[PDB]
Design a binder for this molecule. Structure first.
Ligand SMILES: [Mg+2]
Ligand SMILES: [Mg+2]
Ligand SMILES: [Mg+2]
Ligand SMILES: [Mg+2]
Ligand SMILES: [Mg+2]
Ligand SMILES: [Mg+2]
Ligand SMILES: [Mg+2]
Ligand SMILES: [Mg+2]
Ligand SMILES: [Mg+2]
Ligand SMILES: [Mg+2]
Ligand SMILES: [Mg+2]
Ligand SMILES: [Mg+2]
Ligand SMILES: [Mg+2]
Ligand SMILES: [Mg+2]
Ligand SMILES: [Mg+2]
Ligand SMILES: [Mg+2]
Ligand SMILES: [Mg+2]
Ligand SMILES: [Mg+2]
Ligand SMILES: [Mg+2]
Lengths: 136, 76, 98, 59, 188
RNA sequence: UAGCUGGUUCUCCCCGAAAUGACUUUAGGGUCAGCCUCAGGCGCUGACUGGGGCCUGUAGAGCACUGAUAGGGCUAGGGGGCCCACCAGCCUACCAAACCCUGUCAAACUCCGAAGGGUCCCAGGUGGAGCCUGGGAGUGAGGGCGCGAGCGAUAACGUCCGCGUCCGAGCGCGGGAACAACCGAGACCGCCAGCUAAGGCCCCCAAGUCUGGGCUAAGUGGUAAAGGAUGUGGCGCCGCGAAGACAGCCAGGAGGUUGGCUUAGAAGCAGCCAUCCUUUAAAGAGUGCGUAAUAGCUCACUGGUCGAGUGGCGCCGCGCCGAAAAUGA
RNA sequence: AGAGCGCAAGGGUAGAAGGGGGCCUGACUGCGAGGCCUGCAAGCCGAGCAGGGGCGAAAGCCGGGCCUAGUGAACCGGUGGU
RNA sequence: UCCCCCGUGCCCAUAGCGGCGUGGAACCACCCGUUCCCAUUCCGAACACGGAAGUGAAACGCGCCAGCGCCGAUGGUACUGGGCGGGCGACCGCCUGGGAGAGUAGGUCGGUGCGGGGG
């Protein structure tokens, strides 16, 4: 990344913008609850996704962490926290689309996304595709 | 750390509003630069202060490209 | 270019828009805050002969008569992106000389 | 502007200042109080903001 | 396709949904009317119907209008349609996203590749009479690392690409298993 | 001397606060301001409200600036290769600026932008309203709770700001078992009167073992999660079915082929890829177990048996596991 | 308008506040209606008036730098005048 | 009363980028010349002066087209004064009043003052 040091905490209101639509691939993974997803949680799901089906197709990770996660070294109250301990996170709100595979069968995706679900803190759901876009 | 710092509040912005009677010289509105332009019977100072030159009522007139003007319609 | 024009606008009343042609030289006493011309003594497009400079002097005197008739006197001249020296000079020159 | 019977039933205790001042403008003292006022535009707005505290009647 | 529509007026928008009706509105260059379809009906209908084929709406007025959903407001928080538009056609040409059936076995899949696909549909100016269920895509000579653009599309008669003459259509990306995981874990 | 602690004596009557701001060798003290109360003045100006004008940059949304940013195309530059130094040309499932498209993020980004609030004019508004002058204080540790933010760990009866409230001072009264601030409700005194508020209406305990309609058999109720499971009920979708379905049952479950490559050894059953034909009512270039490897058991398939339903999927409610603590439950 | 506007950042700005040349010293004295901000003190804006002076043909502008930081009550004492 | 022009103010892009076409007697610009007023840190490019020919190319004025810029409803959401409910929490839902942004249909190569010249 790149920008500067620290950022506010902020609350996680309605599941508004934190939500989209299967923009790529065939299948997808949607969050049911709000939460800051850690960089490790992402890597955890990603590796587990590709490691399941070897030489798999293409995996799209729509979300992206950029919020500095603050934290203090087990002391008290001098200034703002050093943060960075857990690294970064992404404002994931219900409805959002974290992962979505492509160029692969339905069983591989059904299992891989299911697996990559446990790698994530939030209770999730898997959506097919339908045709819901925006046209005529 | 080394951060706790901030110059106290200058308390700027719109002082007088439209539909308000005013004397002669009343600082109608203080501003940072040119968020508002002068106008009919309305002068300004170094700090870009808007103030009446006559006696009357304040009025606002947006004009897109030109900007937002403010003036006082005389009457007695 | 019209900085000068805007300077006079806020100044007061009775502007004197001196728009000159390469051969003509018009002149109007427009009052802002309403947009209305008063004494509009044209030049070549009016009656005068053919001598831009001397024609200017007279057309200026033309404003004077018509103006002094309506009870006006505020010499709110309007350079109108023009250097004061030649044609436009004689304009306010003759107009103010009487 | 027909009459407007308004009876107080919900104690203002615990509600914001403005609401309290409303029942003062309407002249409402104790609980279960009667008070017949006109139906003027302003008087409406005040009885409206406290509708959850009183039961309005069209007389 | 068909669809049983009705006229709206004052029925509460939210309370309407709870019953079983999907709110919506038809309109065109001159028309404008509050309508509302049925959830279950519209669902199965719009499933195949989507936004490529035309669907006439049978109003109680016996009027058969050749409409097609110009837009849909998908509800956040677990996907589900909230609102639906219905652009009515006539005879003047009209733009719209037409389907795209990519057919063939790209050289990419041979050397172990990935079925990339950009525009699964393309907007194109076209007369109302023309209703191509789809357009043939000659994707086959496409090898890994290659791609296909809009300037290389096969257009049927009486139609034009209402898009940029260079836009992409699809591609062929590689896998990403062990070679990347092992290499990336150390190279990062 | 004590800007510190402790004490400060009779009665009834009206009103009635603060625990904030600014400066302080100031922080548990003061000065002015704010909030309380008298006295004398002024008299619809008060709080709150209707209508109208004006100001502003948040929730939200957005990507037009500043930046970040996933994937593709195009493309300057760097690296590797074909190739020869006459130094270019070409490829490059490579690193990758700029530009376009697809898709996003932001307190210190904003093309956009409410509910609302602030203020002036017009009108209701007679209240322990308000404005002016002067006497008198106390107050300058505040706390919960709700909402919006920061800090914290999206910990704390935590902390620090804003808007409001209650305790403070209403530890007076009812409910919540008991409990300052949660819900009701503002106590001048008297009555062996009646209606009601919250919450209740089997007993301790006042009031219906009241009425109709369902859900749950766990003592859930009597309140713990990711995750897990033919627990039970209700709605919608799709497949097979009396031209014979689901399950079990009777037999077969075959050739090339010991599918190609590979392999000490893979023979549908260690590892990689290809990805037919015959017979037939049926048997697939083959699912599980076994074996060094074959042999052997199995499913889908077909037929007979058999005879009325059956399987999968999604959604709504209650419930189960997940669940281990110290004197007696 | 993404530059510039001496120096931080913001609001502003080419319909100049930005770059150049000419003349020149209002980087005046004596005042100050009426205001913003405000507990106090302090800070900030300022039309218009008089004397007198600069640039301009003139209408007119000038009581220091586009602007918001570049500062210190009182006391005690120094130097020049009245 | 009506049409085309010159000036000049108003609405502040639905009035512009652009592609094409039109207009010259009259208005306007360009064009001739540099002696005089005046000037370019160098140039009569511009600022200035005395004015015949030629042109309407440049620029400007007037029309046409929607490829870009721009304006953009309707319906439904997001959010929210005020009132109320559910969870352990992160939070979620209902009544009333209010209500964008985005996107879709669509709309635009401008309207309008006063004075003046010509028919
Ligand atoms: Mg999970
Ligand atoms: Mg103190
Ligand atoms: Mg005091
Ligand atoms: Mg936001
Ligand atoms: Mg108001
Ligand atoms: Mg409090
Ligand atoms: Mg109290
Ligand atoms: Mg109690
Ligand atoms: Mg009750
Ligand atoms: Mg248990
Ligand atoms: Mg700038
Ligand atoms: Mg200058
Ligand atoms: Mg300067
Ligand atoms: Mg003061
Ligand atoms: Mg200062
Ligand atoms: Mg003087
Ligand atoms: Mg002293
Ligand atoms: Mg021609
Ligand atoms: Mg909009």
């Amino acid at each position: 990344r790149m920008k500067y040091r620290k950022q506010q905490r902020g609350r996680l209101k309605g599941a508004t913008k934190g939500g989209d639509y299967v923009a790529f691939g065939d299948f997808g993974l949607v969050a049911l609850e709000p939460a800051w997803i850690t960089a490790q949680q992402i890597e955890a799901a990603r590796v587990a996704m590709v490691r399941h089906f070897r030489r798999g197709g293409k995996i799209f990770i729509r979300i992206f962490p950029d919020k500095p996660y603050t934290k203090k070294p087990l002391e008290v109250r001098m200034g703002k926290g050093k943060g960075n301990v857990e690294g970064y996170v992404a404002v994931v709100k219900p409805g959002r689309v974290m992962f979505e595979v492509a160029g692969v069968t339905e069983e591989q995706a059904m299992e891989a996304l299911r697996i990559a679900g446990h790698k994530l803190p939030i209770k999730t759901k898997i959506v097919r595709r339908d045709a819901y876009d925006e046209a005529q | 750390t080394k951060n706790g710092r901030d110059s106290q509040a200058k308390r700027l912005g719109v002082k007088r509003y439209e539909g308000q009677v005013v004397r002669a010289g009343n600082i109608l509105v203080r501003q940072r630069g040119t968020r508002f332009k002068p106008g009919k019977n309305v002068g300004m100072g170094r700090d870009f202060t808007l103030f009446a030159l006559v006696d009357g009522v304040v009025e606002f007139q947006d004009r897109g490209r030109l900007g937002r003007y403010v003036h006082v319609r005389p009457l007695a | 270019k019209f900085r000068v024009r805007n300077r006079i606008k806020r100044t007061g009343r009775l502007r004197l828009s001196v728009f000159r042609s390469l051969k003509h030289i018009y002149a109007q006493i427009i009052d802002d805050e309403k947009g209305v011309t008063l004494v509009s003594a044209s030049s070549l497009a009016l009656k005068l002969k053919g001598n831009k400079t001397e024609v200017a002097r007279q057309v200026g005197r033309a404003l004077a008569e018509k103006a002094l008739a309506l009870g006006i006197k505020q010499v709110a001249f309007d350079r109108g992106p023009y250097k004061y020296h030649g044609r436009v000079k004689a304009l306010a020159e003759g107009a103010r000389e009487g | 502007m027909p009459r407007l019977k308004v009876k107080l039933v919900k104690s203002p205790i615990g509600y914001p200042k403005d609401q309290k001042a409303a029942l003062k403008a309407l002249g409402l003292r104790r609980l279960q109080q009667e008070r017949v006022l006109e139906d003027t535009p302003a008087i409406r707005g005040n009885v409206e903001k406290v509708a959850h505290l009183v039961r309005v009647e069209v007389v | 396709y068909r669809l049983k529509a009705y006229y709206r007026e004052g029925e509460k928008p939210s309370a309407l949904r709870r019953a079983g009706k999907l709110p919506g509105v038809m309109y065109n260059r001159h028309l404008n009317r509050k309508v509302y379809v049925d959830l279950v009906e519209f669902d199965k209908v719009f499933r195949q119907a989507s936004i490529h084929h035309v669907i006439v709406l049978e109003l109680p007025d016996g009027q058969s209008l050749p409409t097609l959903v110009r837009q849909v407001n998908l509800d956040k928080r677990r996907r589900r349609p909230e609102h639906v538009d219905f652009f009515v056609l006539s005879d003047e040409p009209v733009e719209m996203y037409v389907p795209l059936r990519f057919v063939g076995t790209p050289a990419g899949v041979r050397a172990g590749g990935v079925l990339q696909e950009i525009h699964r549909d393309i907007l194109v100016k076209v007369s109302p009479r023309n209703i191509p269920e789809f357009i043939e895509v000659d994707v086959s000579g496409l090898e890994i690392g290659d791609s296909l653009h809009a300037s290389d599309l096969k257009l049927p008669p009486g139609v034009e690409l209402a898009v940029s003459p260079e836009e992409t259509i699809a591609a062929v990306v590689p896998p990403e298993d062990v070679e990347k995981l092992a290499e990336e874990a150390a190279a990062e």
